[PDB]
């Protein structure tokens, strides 16, 4: 008998994407080789994010990319922006800057606006060819907690979270337990 | 046969010491407390106002808030499988500084002084404490201290 506590035994990380996309598997195979044969943490980060699920790869907008690379103390003038996910369009930005963006997929409107503005859109294999180690690359992520489920996660007394309500308005969870005039307020 | 009063089972906990009743010393009100100070909680039975719960008696915490006549001692209490932060507002009569912090401050000052002195002298400093080392080798002498032979004493009546 051996007295060993088994707490951190099974790793909780994906070693393979759940998707059955053949092209995604081809990208994973390419970046498995890149991560193994290069000492750059960028390739490992890309390979890890290739395994991630849809919720763990939130979309990003060209306005967000433009805002992040146009900061005053940024010096990200001509650097290529890389996101492992979908790049969406933001119609609120009437004029699109010239951006070099590499992503898994592009919205038709976003890709058209980038090309019309004079930028370039690249896939991950193209990004690997141009920057095999990720040099001079701005790696970005979308907002993970921007989805609906995180408005309700952690709901409880005095947590200020959104309840699961069939409808919205009076007569729907706006009574005893929500205000002082009705017994108590949460 | 169980009651949940605030001061239940505090008969000896909140008692004043023998020949220690009456006037409360006024140096307690003259002591200065700041946010971040480590203080001990010792409930005084004469001051009923601002009394902390019996659980916090004898505990140690950090002050986060300072008011006119009270402090904000912060404690961590076990409620099962976790610690929770308890923020108790306690009058300064039940609060005193921890002498360990004063000793630790003096130790830090001595360590820095030794560090600067060793840097000037160009030698080792040895700032890290060590546990009690095993006893070294000595040469205990017997002159004028000749050993005395001892024998077990026979049992006898001692009444």
């Amino acid at each position: 008998g051996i007295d060993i506590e088994r707490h951190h035994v099974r790793k909780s990380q994906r070693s393979k994407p759940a998707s059955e996309n053949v092209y995604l598997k081809l990208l994973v195979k390419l970046y498995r080789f890149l991560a193994r044969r290069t000492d750059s943490r960028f390739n490992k980060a890309i390979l890890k994010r290739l395994f991630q699920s849809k919720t763990n790869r939130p979309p990003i907008s060209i306005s967000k990319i433009a805002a992040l690379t146009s900061r005053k103390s940024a010096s990200l003038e001509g650097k290529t922006t890389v996101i492992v996910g979908t790049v969406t369009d933001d119609e609120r930005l009437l004029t699109v800057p010239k951006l070099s963006v590499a992503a898994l997929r592009f919205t038709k409107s976003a890709r058209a606006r980038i090309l019309k503005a004079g930028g370039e859109v690249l896939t991950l294999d193209q990004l690997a060819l141009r920057a095999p180690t990720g040099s001079n690359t701005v790696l970005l992520r979308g907002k993970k907690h921007a989805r609906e489920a995180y408005r309700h996660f952690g709901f409880g007394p005095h947590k200020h979270k959104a309840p699961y309500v069939r409808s919205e308005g009076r007569k729907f969870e706006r009574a005893r337990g929500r205000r002082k005039s009705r017994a108590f307020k949460v | 046969p169980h009651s949940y009063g605030i001061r239940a089972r505090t008969r000896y906990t909140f008692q004043r010491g023998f020949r220690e009743h009456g006037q409360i010393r006024l140096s307690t009100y003259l002591k200065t407390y700041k946010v971040g100070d480590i203080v001990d909680i010792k409930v005084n039975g004469a001051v009923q106002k601002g009394m902390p719960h019996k659980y916090y008696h004898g505990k140690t915490g950090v002050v986060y808030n300072v008011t006119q006549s009270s402090v904000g001692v912060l404690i961590y209490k076990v409620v099962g499988n976790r610690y929770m932060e308890k923020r108790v507002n306690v009058r300064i009569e039940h609060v005193k500084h921890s002498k360990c912090r004063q000793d630790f401050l003096d130790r830090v000052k001595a360590n820095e002084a030794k560090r600067k002195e060793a840097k000037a002298q160009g030698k080792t400093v040895q700032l890290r404490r060590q546990p009690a080392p095993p006893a070294t080798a000595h040469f205990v002498s017997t002159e004028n201290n000749e050993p005395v032979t001892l024998h077990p004493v026979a049992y006898d009546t001692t009444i």
Partner: protein, 173 residues
């Protein structure tokens, strides 16, 4: 087997008394660790000293000066009974005081069901004068013309013939 050790110890010197006294004891223990344990056991009962607050400055095994000479050993002991405590005196004829102590322990265990933990050896001395001997059984062995028959024994055993299951003839005496 038991061994005899002399153990010299003292309290750890303090600010009050830089020169503590040295105390020596002659103890019978299977090994040095037990001898030191016995030394502290007896010292705790006499002086305000413990193992933590004291130290052992010397320990030496003692051998019999005359292991080839038959001697009479008088042993004074104090032992705890099931009811109370009694002091007794024993006499054993042996060549070593270690053997006399071992015989004393065996006799006490056989005749009083007294374990090692319940026996304290107060004193062991060697009897020199014939009239000093107290037990008549011991003193009867000092007769120069001593002659007794061979004590009864379970015949003569052999490593092979003793293990033999059957014998052709009944043994004689």
């Amino acid at each position: 087997a038991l061994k005899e050790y002399q153990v010299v110890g003292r309290k750890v010197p303090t600010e009050h008394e830089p020169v503590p006294k040295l105390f020596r004891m002659r103890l019978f223990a299977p090994n040095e660790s037990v001898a030191k344990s016995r030394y502290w056991y007896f010292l705790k009962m006499i002086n305000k000293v413990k193992k933590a607050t004291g130290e052992i400055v010397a320990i030496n095994e003692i051998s019999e000066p005359k292991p080839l000479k038959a001697k009479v050993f008088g042993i004074w002991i104090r032992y705890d009974s099931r009811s109370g405590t009694h002091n007794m005196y024993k006499e054993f004829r042996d060549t070593t005081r270690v053997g006399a102590v071992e015989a004393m322990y065996a006799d006490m265990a056989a005749r009083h069901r007294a374990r090692f933990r319940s026996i304290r050896i107060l004193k062991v001395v060697e009897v020199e004068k014939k009239e000093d001997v107290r037990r008549n059984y011991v003193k009867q062995l000092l007769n120069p013309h001593l002659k007794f028959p061979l004590p009864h024994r379970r015949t003569g055993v052999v490593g092979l013939a003793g293990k033999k299951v059957f014998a052709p003839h009944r043994p004689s005496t």
